[PDB]
Design a protein around this ligand. Structure first.
Ligand SMILES: CCCCCCCCCCCCCC(=O)O
Ligand SMILES: CCCCCCCCCCCCCC(=O)O
Ligand SMILES: [Cl-]
Ligand SMILES: [Cl-]
Ligand SMILES: [Zn+2]
Ligand SMILES: [Zn+2]
Lengths: 29, 21, 29, 21
């Protein structure tokens, strides 16, 4: 699923913005 | 997971905040 | 520090590609 | 951390793998 892989690339970029200094864990399916 | 929620529908920044530490 | 944040943006993208289905954890200083 | 190790020097793919889950 290429589009799923492409979507996850934007998701981690989005998380890095919102979470900031708090950090985050990325746990896909 | 985040892929299920946010790749099937648009997640706002507030919705994405739930996955932060 | 803006320069640190710019490097972190590329940090998250590289981890997403390298780690794959395992996922990754990111925490700034 | 990853920022200290990899924003001061170029980290290889294997070095980045240390921060995977
Ligand atoms: C623009 C389309 C982006 C791709 C949409 C992917 C939808 C979520 C798929 C997640 C993987 C299967 C989830 C279940 O199990
Ligand atoms: C493009 C890189 C710009 C400089 C980024 C420096 C990142 C390392 C700083 C992390 C904090 C060091 C203090 C300890 O912890
Ligand atoms: Cl895309
Ligand atoms: Cl840059
Ligand atoms: Zn894209
Ligand atoms: Zn850049």
């Amino acid at each position: 699923f290429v589009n799923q892989h492409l979507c996850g690339s934007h998701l981690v970029e989005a998380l890095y913005l919102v979470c900031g200094e708090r950090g985050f864990f990325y746990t896909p399916k | 997971g985040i892929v299920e929620q946010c790749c099937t529908s648009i997640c706002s920044l507030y919705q994405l905040e739930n996955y932060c530490n």
